[PDB]
Design a protein around this ligand. Structure first.
Ligand SMILES: CC(C)CCC[C@@H](C)[C@H]1CC[C@H]2[C@@H]3[C@@H](O)C=C4C[C@@H](O)CC[C@]4(C)[C@H]3CC[C@]12C
Length: 436
């Protein structure tokens, strides 16, 4: 049917009613075929680097050229600061990919495919137009199905730029049908020997009543560097802070302590992350300059090998039948193909339980950061990067919502674990079946 017919359709009305008895599992929702996406959530990891040049820019900045690598401030104070500005621009550039991609390609935000345990999604940005860039690899794996957890790593060996992280959410509906989403997990970005800890922000899905869902960000995201510098990004929508949706304000401070006082902000960036934003140095409001304009920079999608040569665990190959049915809009075929895949998984799990066998994650392992780790679990190293960056930011290391600070209510939650997924490069190095 035409989108103008969605809101009043029998299907949408039945869907809205299923929300009333929502059990916390988004998959229990009877989402009509027209609001279904043929893309699995394991693919979302690619959204962290769809702008190759921005992802790699920090690695080209050094003590001998940093002032030549800071468009908004040729008189930038230091290379560490020029790199924090570059990392900040990269982070901002990821937002349109992360949260607006489906509105563009599907017509609105839609229900993504719930990944199966073990699902993989791999590819690479060949960066053929920039030989100095080199190849950038994306590895994404579904390390958990109950609940859904996606772990990932994107790395550029040539320039020594590597990123890793994982993600999971907890959703619930308000009485007004707003879908509140809290993200969990964090992402770490290494630029040679310099490190950055990034925390995703919470968000809500608007437009559910009118059947035209879309994402709006809220709360805060942090970018804590090993250099001490810290960027605090605050998100707002419609009005409140800005008069336009998808707005934000980011401030860079010399350190976590200085972030308590907004006046100590070295720079202040503001505007829309899906559009244009300006930057002001110190309090020199009269000297604002264009920081980023998402409309001028086309996203670059990674290269994925053809279906014919994909491993059975690779997302697109495994979901092929379901994706085809969804694109066709065939109610029965969608149910049939989805059940076939999911029922096979269920049988697999039941067998593992009966045979006393466990699913082994391929490239990621869960590290127990708790003071009282499970006897068989892996424990973090001495100079763990996350530990020091989280300490500098005073970020909680527990499995609390992303961005939770030590002392916050979420951090004082009783019996809350502190297990985090970590990429094991060695495991990819000795990979025997998967290729790019
Ligand atoms: C849309 C509605 C009909 C059903 C509910 C869909 C809901 C579960 C989807 C829709 C938006 C999805 C977000 C997506 O906006 C972007 C990201 C960023 C990525 O890094 C991690 C996943 C996440 C949070 C998606 C989770 C699933 C969401 C909320």
């Amino acid at each position: 049917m035409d989108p103008s017919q969605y809101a009043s359709s029998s299907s949408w009305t039945s869907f809205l009613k299923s929300i009333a008895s929502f059990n916390g599992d988004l998959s229990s929702l009877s989402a009509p075929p027209f609001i279904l996406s043929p893309i699995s959530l394991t693919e979302f990891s690619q959204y962290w680097a769809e702008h190759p040049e921005l992802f790699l820019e920090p690695s080209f900045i050094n003590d001998d050229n940093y002032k030549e690598h800071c468009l908004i401030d040729p008189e930038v104070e230091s290379p560490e600061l020029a790199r924090m500005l570059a990392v900040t621009k990269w982070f901002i550039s990821t937002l349109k990919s992360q949260y607006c991609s489906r509105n563009e390609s599907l017509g609105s935000e839609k229900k993504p495919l719930n990944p199966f345990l073990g699902e993989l999604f791999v590819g690479k940005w060949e960066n053929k137009e920039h030989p100095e860039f080199g190849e950038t690899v994306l590895l994404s794996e579904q390390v958990s199905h109950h609940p859904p957890v996606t772990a990932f790593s994107i790395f550029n060996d040539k320039n020594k730029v590597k990123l890793q992280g994982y993600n999971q959410i907890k959703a619930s509906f308000t009485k007004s049908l707003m879908l509140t989403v809290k993200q969990f997990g964090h992402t770490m970005l290494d630029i040679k020997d310099e490190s950055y800890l990034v925390t995703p922000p919470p968000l809500h899905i608007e437009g559910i009543l009118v059947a035209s869902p879309f994402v709006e960000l809220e709360g805060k995201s942090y970018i804590q560097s090993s250099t001490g510098l810290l960027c605090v990004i605050e998100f707002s929508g419609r009005g409140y802070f800005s008069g336009k949706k998808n707005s934000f304000k980011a401030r860079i401070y010399k350190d976590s302590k200085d972030s308590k006082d907004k006046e100590k902000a070295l720079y202040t960036i503001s505007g829309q992350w899906s559009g244009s934003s300006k930057i002001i140095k110190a309090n020199k409001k009269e000297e604002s300059r264009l920081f980023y304009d998402a409309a001028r920079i086309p996203a670059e999608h990674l290269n994925v090998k053809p279906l014919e040569e994909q491993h059975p665990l690779e997302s697109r190959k495994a979901w092929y039948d379901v994706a085809g049915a969804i694109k066709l809009g065939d109610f029965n075929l969608i149910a049939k193909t989805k059940t076939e895949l999911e029922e096979t998984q269920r049988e697999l799990r039941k067998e593992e339980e009966a045979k006393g066998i466990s699913w082994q994650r391929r490239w990621f392992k869960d590290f127990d950061y708790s003071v009282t780790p499970e006897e068989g679990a892996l424990v973090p190293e001495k100079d763990d990067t996350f530990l020091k960056l989280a300490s500098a930011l005073n970020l909680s290391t527990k499995n609390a919502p992303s961005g939770t600070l030590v002392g916050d209510k979420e951090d004082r939650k009783e019996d809350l674990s502190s297990i985090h997924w970590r990429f094991q490069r060695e495991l990819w190095d000795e990979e025997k079946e998967i290729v790019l």
